[PDB]
Amino acid sequence: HMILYGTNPIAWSNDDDRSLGAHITLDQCLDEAAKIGFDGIEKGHKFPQEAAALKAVLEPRGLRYVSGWHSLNLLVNSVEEEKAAMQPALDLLKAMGSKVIIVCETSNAIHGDNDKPLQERPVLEDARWEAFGLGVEALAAHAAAQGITLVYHHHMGTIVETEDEIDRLMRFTGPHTRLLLDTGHCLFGRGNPERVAQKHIARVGHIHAKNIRRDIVQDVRDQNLSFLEGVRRGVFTVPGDTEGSVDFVPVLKIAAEHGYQGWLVIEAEQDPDVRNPFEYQSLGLKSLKAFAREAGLDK
Numbered sequence: 001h002m003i004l005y006g007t008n009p010i011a012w013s014n015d016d017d018r019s020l021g022a023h024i025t026l027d028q029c030l031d032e033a034a035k036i037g038f039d040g041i042e043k044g045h046k047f048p049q050e051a052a053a054l055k056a057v058l059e060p061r062g063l064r065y066v067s068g069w070h071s072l073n074l075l076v077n078s079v080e081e082e083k084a085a086m087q088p089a090l091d092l093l094k095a096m097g098s099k100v101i102i103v104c105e106t107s108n109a110i111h112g113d114n115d116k117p118l119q120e121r122p123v124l125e126d127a128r129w130e131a132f133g134l135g136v137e138a139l140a141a142h143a144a145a146q147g148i149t150l151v152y153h154h155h156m157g158t159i160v161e162t163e164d165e166i167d168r169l170m171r172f173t174g175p176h177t178r179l180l181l182d183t184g185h186c187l188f189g190r191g192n193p194e195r196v197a198q199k200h201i202a203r204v205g206h207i208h209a210k211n212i213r214r215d216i217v218q219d220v221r222d223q224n225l226s227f228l229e230g231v232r233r234g235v236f237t238v239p240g241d242t243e244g245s246v247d248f249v250p251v252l253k254i255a256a257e258h259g260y261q262g263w264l265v266i267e268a269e270q271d272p273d274v275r276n277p278f279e280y281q282s283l284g285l286k287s288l289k290a291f292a293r294e295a296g297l298d299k
């Protein structure tokens with residue numbers, strides 16, 4: 001298959017807030033992911049991080065290891081310390097057959113901080129962009145030399161949140177640095193997912209099909225809520241949820257027209273007691289494959 005459909009375990013057990021889905025075992029998450037029809041799944045905090053142990057739980061369920069989030073600290077640590085911090089991840093990904101590493105600068109991020117409003121998120125001083133981009137590119141050239149493509153995950157609560165900042169990451173990196181286009185964080189960050197795709201599709205190496213509930217996002221902005229408070233209130237949902245406001249097909253149409261190959265991952269943080277992951281992830285996969293057909297991406 002030229003298009004593979006993935007999921008992310010934070011639908012089942014949240015990574016940032018371990019009180020969300022704490023009771024849901026790895027075994028349940030993986031059973032339901034396979035049963036729903038996903039081709040693979042991304043790293044979650046309950047995943048073994050050794051190759052044999054991770055293979056032992058994914059292979060019985062027909063699940064490929066899509067990729068894993070790896071946190072960056074380029075703003076406080078040297079490049080060589082950051083290459084040495086990503087290497088264990090690069091080795092696991094190779095042993096698992098994965099082709100992508102997902103990265104985000106978190107050294108000053110606030111999305112994991114429950115008590116910090118999202119409006120207080122860090123902004124990278126204008127003079128530090130050139131150095132920061134160069135450092136990201138150095139990790140991506142390092143990764144590429146090993147078969148792994150770096151995809152940068154712009155993210156609420158980080159220095160890469162707005163559309164303008166996505167454009168600055170793209171100006172100050174390349175050619176090995178790719179963009180992970182997350183439709184949910186892009187709209188949450190007041191950006192236009194379609195317009196971002198128009199500009200950067202040729203650099204997009206990985207796509208997260210995430211939806212937002214416009215009602216809840218407007219609540220987050222007005223009441224000054226943290227990222228994890230938005231998550232608990234349902235700021236995110238899946239493709240095809242009527243309460244959502246992301247327009248998926250135009251983004252998938254841009255991807256089709258330039259020949260995107262690879263994964264589309266449904267990543268939807270929700271409170272799983274209220275928003276059953278089996279239900280919402282079933283809805284997501286059903287709707288995203290429809291949208292991908294309508295877009296001519298999945299032919």
Ligand SMILES: [Mn+2]
Pocket residue numbers: 153182208210267
């Ligand atoms: Mn994502």
